[PDB]
Amino acid sequence: NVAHGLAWSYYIGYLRLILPELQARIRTYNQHYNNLLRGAVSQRLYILLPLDCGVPDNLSMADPNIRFLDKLPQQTGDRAGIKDRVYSNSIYELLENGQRAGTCVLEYATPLQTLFAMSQYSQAGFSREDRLEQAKLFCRTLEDILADAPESQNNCRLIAYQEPDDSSFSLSQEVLRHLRQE
Amino acid sequence: NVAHGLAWSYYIGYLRLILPELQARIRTYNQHYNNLLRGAVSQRLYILLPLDCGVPDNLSMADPNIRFLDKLPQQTGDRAGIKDRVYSNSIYELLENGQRAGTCVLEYATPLQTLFAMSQYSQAGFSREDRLEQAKLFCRTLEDILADAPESQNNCRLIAYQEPDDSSFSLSQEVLRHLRQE
Ligand SMILES: COc1cc2sc(C(=O)CCC(=O)O)cc2cc1SCSc1cc2cc(C(=O)CCC(=O)O)sc2cc1OC
């Protein structure tokens, strides 16, 4: 029930507003003289969606192969008393064994971090057994809403991963893999 | 259950981050030469929380006595892949019968607009009977979390109103009333 809400409020309150735009984000950045012909930024927002853990804020400390590159242009909007709502995203370079596969506008779905916090907040009453179905149904609902919303289904790709045990998991390869897919 | 999540994710994902700061927002704006001694902006974020209707985006069209004044300084942060998350708020002037009672940093709680949208989204399965308990428990949970979070309890005031029938309701007086309260 909780994850359901957050997925709807993430789409309606954020994606539903910035997915129809943001094409010029990677248009101006890739054609900037200080990076002209140095990787063309991809046409979509790659959302990192962990499934077992709380979302980290810094990508460098999470995966060494992940490296902060730069920040793309900012935006504006009339949002609940904010006639100029600034939207900003940060570009990252996927460096797999020194070899940089590429760079794209990247960010984690923030509502996923909030539904993890809820489990260690005894007032919210969210339990760790439900947690699994929560983070999962947040990605599921975000995939399901993106299906019924074709104007949002494109312009964004979802990167979900489950790494509970050790299998040299790398959240950096998942991205490079998803970019080459289509 | 849904409203519960949104209130937690609004605090943890937005208020819990910008309430400890934002004091300098009204400090620099009130002392700007183009407004020096023309109303000192209040020290808190006044959140508009309707209880029966969907939040409007524009305040002018909602209440004539409400009038857009200006926008305050912007902010930055390390948020899920965004090393510079821009936070921006807009100041409004409460004009009651020509007489401007004052001006303060104002905005509607955006998660309230999303929980209304959910009622007319048959996929989300949210019903209009629950809607009442939803919008209500979103404000209730936001008041309850602000009680257990003293570092956030201050620096913000909640303005909840229920106007289903006609009683010349004015969402402009509610604000001026709340500012003089303390
Ligand atoms: C209304 O519902 C949401 C709006 C946004 S906007 C947003 C970002 O831009 C990503 C930056 C970040 O989150 O770090 C994420 C969400 C997620 C939700 S789901 C409800 S819980 C919540 C509410 C809230 C309000 C925020 C505002 O800045 C106010 C303006 C607005 O919402 O349009 S951020 C935010 C984050 C939330 O949970 C993650």
CB atoms under 10 Å from CB of A150, counted, come to 8
Q: Rounded distance, CA A85 to CA A126, Å?
A: 32
Resolution in A: 2.3
Q: Obtained via which technique?
A: X-ray
Structural domain for B122, as ranges:
2-180
Query: Under a CB-based contact definition with an 8 Å cutoff, are residues A67 and A61 in contact?
Result: no
Q: How many domains does chain A have?
A: 1
A-B CB pairs within 8 A amount to 138
How far does chain B reach from its first CA to its final CA, in angstroms? Answer: 33
How many helices, marked H, and strands, marked E, lie in chain A?
Answer: 7, 5
Phi, psi of A19 (to 5 degrees): -75, -45
CATH number of domain containing A124: 3.40.50.12100
* Strand pairing class (B90-96; A90-96): unpaired
Q: Compute the distance between CA of residue A59 and CA of residue A171 in angstroms, rounded to an integer.
A: 9
Residue nearest to atom 23 of ligand 1 (CA): B10
* Residue A1 touches partner B, C-beta closer than 8 Å: yes
- Three-state SS annotation for A98-164: CEEEEEEEEEECHHHHHHHHHHHCCCCCCCHHHHHHHHHHHHHHHHHHHHHCHHHHCCEEEEEECCC
Residues of B in contact with A9 (CB under 8 A): 6, 9, 111, 114-115, 118
Helix (H), strand (E) at residue B113: helix B110-117
Do A81 and B110 lie within an 8 Å CB cutoff? Answer: no
Contact list in A for residue B84 (CB cut-off 8 A) is 71, 88, 90
Residue B110 is nearest to which of A80, A107, A110, comparing CB atoms?
A80
Longest Cα–Cα distance in chain A? 53
Dihedral sign computed on CA atoms, order B15, B16, B20, B22:
negative
